[PDB]
Amino acid sequence: DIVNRKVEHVEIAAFENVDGLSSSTFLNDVILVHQGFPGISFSEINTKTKFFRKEISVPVMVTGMTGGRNELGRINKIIAEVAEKFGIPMGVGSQRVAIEKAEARESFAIVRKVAPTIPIIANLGMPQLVKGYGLKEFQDAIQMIEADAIAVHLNPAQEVFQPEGEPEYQIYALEKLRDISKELSVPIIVKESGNGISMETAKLLYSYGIKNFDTSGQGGTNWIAIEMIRDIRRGNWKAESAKNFLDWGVPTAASIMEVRYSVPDSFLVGSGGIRSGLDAAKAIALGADIAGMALPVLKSAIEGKESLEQFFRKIIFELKAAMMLTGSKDVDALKKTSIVILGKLKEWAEYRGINLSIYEKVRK
Amino acid sequence: DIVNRKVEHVEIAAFENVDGLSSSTFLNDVILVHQGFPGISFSEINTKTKFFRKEISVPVMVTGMTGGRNELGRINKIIAEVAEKFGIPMGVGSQRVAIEKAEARESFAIVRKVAPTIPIIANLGMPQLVKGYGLKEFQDAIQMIEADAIAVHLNPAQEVFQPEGEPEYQIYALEKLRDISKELSVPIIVKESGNGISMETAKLLYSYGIKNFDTSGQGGTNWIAIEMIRDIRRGNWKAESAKNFLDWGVPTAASIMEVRYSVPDSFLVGSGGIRSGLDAAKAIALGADIAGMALPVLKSAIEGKESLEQFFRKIIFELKAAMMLTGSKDVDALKKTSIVILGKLKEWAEYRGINLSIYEKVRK
Amino acid sequence: DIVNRKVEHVEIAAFENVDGLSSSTFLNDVILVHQGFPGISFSEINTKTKFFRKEISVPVMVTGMTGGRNELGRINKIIAEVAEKFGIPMGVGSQRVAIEKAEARESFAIVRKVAPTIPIIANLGMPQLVKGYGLKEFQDAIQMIEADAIAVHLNPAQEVFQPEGEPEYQIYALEKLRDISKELSVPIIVKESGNGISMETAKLLYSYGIKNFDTSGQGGTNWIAIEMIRDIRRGNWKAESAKNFLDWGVPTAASIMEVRYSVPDSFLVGSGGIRSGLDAAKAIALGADIAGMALPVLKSAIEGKESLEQFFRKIIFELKAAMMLTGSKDVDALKKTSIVILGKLKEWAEYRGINLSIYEKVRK
Amino acid sequence: DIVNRKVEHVEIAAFENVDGLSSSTFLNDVILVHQGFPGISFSEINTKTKFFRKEISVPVMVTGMTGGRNELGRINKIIAEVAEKFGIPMGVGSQRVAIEKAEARESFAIVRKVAPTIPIIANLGMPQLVKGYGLKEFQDAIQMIEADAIAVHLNPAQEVFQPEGEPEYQIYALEKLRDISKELSVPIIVKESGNGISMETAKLLYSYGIKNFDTSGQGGTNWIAIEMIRDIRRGNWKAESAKNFLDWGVPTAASIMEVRYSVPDSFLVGSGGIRSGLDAAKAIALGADIAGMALPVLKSAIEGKESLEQFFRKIIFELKAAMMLTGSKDVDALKKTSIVILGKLKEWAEYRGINLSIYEKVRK
Numbered sequence A, B, C, D: 001d002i003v004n005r006k007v008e009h010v011e012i013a014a015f016e017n018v019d020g021l022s023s024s025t026f027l028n029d030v031i032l033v034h035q036g037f038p039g040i041s042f043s044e045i046n047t048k049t050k051f052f053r054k055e056i057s058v059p060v061m062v063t064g065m066t067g068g069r070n071e072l073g074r075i076n077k078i079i080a081e082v083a084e085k086f087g088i089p090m091g092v093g094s095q096r097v098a099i100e101k102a103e104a105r106e107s108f109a110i111v112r113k114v115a116p117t118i119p120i121i122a123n124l125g126m127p128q129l130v131k132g133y134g135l136k137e138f139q140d141a142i143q144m145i146e147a148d149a150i151a152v153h154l155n156p157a158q159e160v161f162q163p164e165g166e167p168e169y170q171i172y173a174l175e176k177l178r179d180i181s182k183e184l185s186v187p188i189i190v191k192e193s194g195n196g197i198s199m200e201t202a203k204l205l206y207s208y209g210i211k212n213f214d215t216s217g218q219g220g221t222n223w224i225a226i227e228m229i230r231d232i233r234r235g236n237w238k239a240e241s242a243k244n245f246l247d248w249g250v251p252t253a254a255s256i257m258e259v260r261y262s263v264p265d266s267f268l269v270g271s272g273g274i275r276s277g278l279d280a281a282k283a284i285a286l287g288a289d290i291a292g293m294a295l296p297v298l299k300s301a302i303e304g305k306e307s308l309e310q311f312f313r314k315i316i317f318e319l320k321a322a323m324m325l326t327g328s329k330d331v332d333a334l335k336k337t338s339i340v341i342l343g344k345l346k347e348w349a350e351y352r353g354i355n356l357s358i359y360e361k362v363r364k
């Protein structure tokens, strides 16, 4: 039944109209300044970067999506085996379903069988931490895929509108997380899920020892829309209310600025509606260390292995194009390349007290 | 004939295109910052608040609308009995028609028969104060429904365009109001009716001892539009002139900022185009103490009791969703949650000398 | 043939699509703050104001349009006799045609026969001043209609695109104007003709003794569009070039600000796209002493006397509505009522060094 | 085969939808202030200006386009003979094709046979400097047309997406350029090709001794779009990636401000989407010394000699119209005429640290 929600999520995300529905990343408000004389050759561009203790080929990761059933495991297999080939890290979806059901385990474990070298990121939800999960469940999630890190997701907006949702975000959960992190052999990443991380949330998490963030801002997969659709489907009246919240959240670009600014030493994944290598380049230039993608990887993987390989080729070419055209020889150079911030994003930053001058210093 | 206007008002408001016609609340310019870690559970959210000497369940009121005839009284009865059930305060429509016609009284009195505990708010127009109404008429309006307060409405824009309108707003009326307030057993609220309260008007009313305001800004029911339609109907040439004023007024959001800023200790209802619990949450976060609704309550009540009950359930769920997602455990926390002000509202505030820093301190 | 241009002008302005074509007044960027308690009664509003040595009923004038042929004279007659009835001043069109042709004189003179008391404003073009017109021509224009003032029009944009146009605006013309003003028994108003007066032009004219200005900004009658159409008609290739300049000029609202700011003691007509009494009210609140109108008076006059009477009633009602709703008892109060400046007009003012604070002081 | 790309470029530029495709010049954000009293006569307007050691009739140049084959040479012939007649300078297209193929030479040389007096500008691409071109190749390009200057183009964005592209922009190329300039008898202009010059690129080039720039910003011919179309045509998957970059680059207007500000003594060509004499006037008022045009000259030349003559008449009239209407008697006066900067251009400048006050001083 949790396994049912799992297939339904994939089905709605993949096949319904939920990508950027009534929402925005604000990334149109970010412009990378063109350099007519780049000072480099396309072929000397170096996209390698660090991901904790490993080196990755490209400053992009696939963020967590699925698992919990055979056909979900075969999607995970395709994603893992292509991510392995391209040298890019992969998060799996929530492993709750596999803590609850032993039959669901193989759909996660397959990932490490087929991807022995890339970083693999485990996944559990924050509500489970308030509902009995602790050290041993985290260790199980980690060992199940020989994870290099664990992502703990924030999805209170999704939980609020989800028919069987669990909107339990008591502070006790952070106390528990902080304790768990003491004993864990791998780092914790705290990621949102379509609604973004603000400076108040980032500072709170940091105060409990969290140093690794994944923005997952509005403007990509709309998880309120997905649950709205699940509510429409089962005649649940929360559907009409969900519609009022479709543009709820911190836009990806605003979230990147907010996290980088409020916690300048954070290791930061910029994700939520990254759809091209240009999006990826903007997210990095703005302040992220790596760009995250989920939905377009799902849709490609469903079409097949070769389709997903072509997808990654395209993303990597686009990223390098944006590095070439900004004179950025490597990832560090891109992080400090010249940008323009305009429009609503500029107004957002101004109101939120993000001094642009100190901002520019911090992102460089 | 006044009773005729009363039915015509309800009919045009309920069934014609007058809601936000060529007007705007500016509430799109207000964004509540999403908190990925709320620090609370949905079920611990407390929406109780004070309304003068009573406690109400939810920081929302139904503002005054109707009365004056049987079928208008049956609408009032539906509204009152549902408002009683939900623990929310209800204003009635103008009681002038019931001061003028004894047959109209029951259509107001029914309200207190069916709603013994909730705050009930009386209603008289400012133009009547200029035209001979005094203490006794106020006392009659109050006792008629055992009111906990009286609303005195400002509708000069409506009166200007109304075929039988009375645009008499001499300053003498305020001297009279101040005198009446000395002797009244319940507080006075001064409310607008679709065109909003500016700082000049708020400060003027305050200088005369008015401490309780209801913004009723532009962006919701368009009363100039209603009278334009009444003019079109009777071939009155004022109709074409009304069309030029459809976007006349202070937008609800700007009016909330203006009243809170210029009279920081005011008890403030934010109303005019509040259509969801998210609107309600924005209005409160901006500076209102409670959100007011009229038109969508009318339209639901016309459909029936159960329809109105479902409407309030939806509003309350949406409000609590916005409280959850900003980490607001109670109404006081919502009043000081993090916001972003963008666009035309920001430009409005800047021109009007609303220092945003002192504004943030004042709204808390 | 000049008489032909006169007929063609009226015909294109009245019946073709040239009103606000690809242009804007910026008046949407000006908002009059609504006062829910005006402090006045509609019937005590006083709209009287000064126009040089005469009193006028309403702070509105009909600006110069036509004359030069019988049917143009009958239009002038209708305008004059209604303007006389309403106590509002009337400018006539360019009297060049009547200096050049004795048969054209009656079409101007009729105006004073039918309107003995209102201010009547003569009209000559600046290019005529560079081409031989002097004191006597001015005196003839004045005595022809017993004028209370003379308007000298600036139309370089129109002259550039006009098939038989005369774009001669040598500085010598100003020396001449200054000399002529020494000897003239009535004041000179310098007016534009759809393209507006900037601060550089206003200060220049002031340095030569001009104190009376009529903005005639872009956003109403588009004179470049009129000449474009005349060019299209006669296969003149200047038509395609005119199209590139359709949005050329200082917007009416910007021009009012610019003239009031740069020449604070000016007597100022705000005109160019004034289409309602609300437009008129905004223009005066912004800084004008009176609002000017041409095109909509033309279109009404063509329909007839009664049609023009209804038009003025509508304008006057709308003005008084805007005065009522801002608590403006008289024209002086309107000149200092509260406004909001937003959008492009705000950006225009900022770039042009119009300090908003000193601006508010100067207009009040 | 390079000859083939040459024909294909002309064909796609002339006949496909690539002019301002998903791009913008930002020139709508620049407004020349209208002067109702110009202080001059149309006929006294002087448009003559300096182009290195020659005088040209009009502050406009045809920037480099084509050559390399007979039919391309006949286009160059038409352009050269009309440019000669109008006294305006002409750049030729890349002469690489003529260094590589002796048969291609006549298609460039024809230009000087038919245009003996106007400035003629040679052309070579920056990638060729990293690939073996040096002094002698420059001298050959120059002598081939008795050039008065050489343009070295920057096209890294084009090279990235070009099927046979050469995205080699190593810094060594500037070292070489600086050396070559020591020994060359004519000055070097560095020009972009539809994606614009930033302050970082301008300052870099300046640090290597480059004093003459041609902005070629986005908003006109979209070279990424041209290569996208060439990619679509040959089934190259880079096509989908090109689509993501269609709005990549510095908008012409922004580039003019950036180069003028960062290198205040530069000799500056403002080009990229200059389509009218009004565009030309804005570019000069903004900070350019001359306006450049390519695409609309190509399209006219393809129609014929008389068509191109009419095109230049139209451009010249529009320029003089804009000078008339700003009171600009000559090109120096236009360079310091009053402007307003609004919108995205204003935001661009602000973020990039272009102080508008020091900007106004520098451009005047």
Ligand SMILES: Cc1cc2nc3c(=O)[nH]c(=O)nc-3n(C[C@H](O)[C@H](O)[C@H](O)COP(=O)(O)O)c2cc1C
Residues within 6 Å of the ligand: A009, A010, A013, A014, A063, A064, A065, A066, A092, A093, A094, A123, A151, A152, A153, A191, A192, A193, A194, A216, A217, A219, A220, A221, A271, A272, A273, A274, A292, A293, A294, A295, A296, A298
């Ligand atoms: C079908 C699907 C399932 C997902 N499930 C999870 C989950 O189990 N755990 C998690 O942390 N994020 C999950 N996500 C959220 C993504 O990891 C990501 O944060 C979000 O979708 C925004 O990125 P995108 O716009 O590139 O999809 C899911 C995404 C998709 C499309």
Ligand SMILES: Cc1cc2nc3c(=O)[nH]c(=O)nc-3n(C[C@H](O)[C@H](O)[C@H](O)COP(=O)(O)O)c2cc1C
Residues within 6 Å of the ligand: B009, B010, B013, B014, B063, B064, B065, B066, B092, B093, B094, B123, B151, B152, B153, B191, B192, B193, B194, B216, B217, B219, B220, B221, B271, B272, B273, B274, B292, B293, B294, B295, B296, B298
């Ligand atoms: C049919 C109807 C009649 C109304 N009559 C009154 C009135 O008698 N007195 C009053 O103060 N306001 C009256 N109102 C104005 C409302 O109380 C409220 O201020 C305004 O409609 C804006 O709120 P809304 O957009 O939620 O309707 C009326 C509203 C409606 C829809």
Ligand SMILES: Cc1cc2nc3c(=O)[nH]c(=O)nc-3n(C[C@H](O)[C@H](O)[C@H](O)COP(=O)(O)O)c2cc1C
Residues within 6 Å of the ligand: C009, C010, C013, C014, C063, C064, C065, C066, C092, C093, C094, C095, C123, C151, C152, C153, C191, C192, C193, C194, C216, C217, C219, C220, C221, C271, C272, C273, C274, C292, C293, C294, C295, C296, C298
């Ligand atoms: C048909 C017509 C002819 C006009 N001719 C004259 C003219 O002779 N002299 C003059 O000063 N302005 C003349 N005007 C310009 C107007 O006085 C006015 O400045 C301009 O039309 C802007 O006002 P509007 O938008 O209300 O028309 C003419 C206007 C119209 C509609």
Ligand SMILES: Cc1cc2nc3c(=O)[nH]c(=O)nc-3n(C[C@H](O)[C@H](O)[C@H](O)COP(=O)(O)O)c2cc1C
Residues within 6 Å of the ligand: D009, D010, D013, D063, D064, D065, D066, D092, D093, D094, D095, D123, D151, D152, D153, D191, D192, D193, D194, D216, D217, D219, D220, D221, D271, D272, D273, D274, D292, D293, D294, D295, D296, D298
């Ligand atoms: C068909 C065509 C070919 C071009 N080839 C050249 C080239 O060989 N060298 C060069 O420097 N620029 C070349 N350009 C770029 C233009 O000179 C100019 O910088 C750019 O097109 C922007 O101006 P526009 O928008 O007026 O076309 C070419 C332009 C066109 C339309």
Ligand SMILES: CC(C)CCOP(=O)(O)OP(=O)(O)O
Residues within 6 Å of the ligand: A002, A005, A094, A095, A096, A097, A124, A125, A153, A154, A155, A158, A193, A223
């Ligand atoms: C986006 C995302 C977190 C989707 C998973 O949400 P979920 O609440 O269904 O996950 P759980 O299985 O952990 O409850």
Ligand SMILES: CC(C)CCOP(=O)(O)OP(=O)(O)O
Residues within 6 Å of the ligand: B002, B005, B009, B094, B095, B096, B097, B124, B125, B153, B154, B155, B158, B193, B223
């Ligand atoms: C919005 C609102 C005040 C509608 C009632 O206006 P009205 O002038 O019809 O009310 P009265 O019966 O008090 O005159």
Ligand SMILES: CC(C)CCOP(=O)(O)OP(=O)(O)O
Residues within 6 Å of the ligand: C002, C005, C094, C095, C096, C097, C124, C125, C153, C154, C155, C158, C193, C223
């Ligand atoms: C708007 C306006 C001045 C129209 C009259 O322009 P015109 O050049 O036709 O007038 P003249 O008869 O004075 O030349």
Ligand SMILES: CC(C)CCOP(=O)(O)OP(=O)(O)O
Residues within 6 Å of the ligand: D002, D005, D094, D095, D096, D097, D124, D125, D153, D154, D155, D158, D193, D223
């Ligand atoms: C715009 C422009 C420079 C077009 C010419 O680019 P190209 O790379 O084809 O020129 P080359 O022949 O110099 O390579």
Ligand SMILES: [Mg+2]
Residues within 6 Å of the ligand: A125, A127, A159, A166
């Ligand atoms: Mg969950």
Ligand SMILES: [Mg+2]
Residues within 6 Å of the ligand: B125, B127, B159, B166
């Ligand atoms: Mg009334």
Ligand SMILES: [Mg+2]
Residues within 6 Å of the ligand: C125, C127, C159, C166
């Ligand atoms: Mg003329």
Ligand SMILES: [Mg+2]
Residues within 6 Å of the ligand: D125, D127, D159, D166
């Ligand atoms: Mg090349």
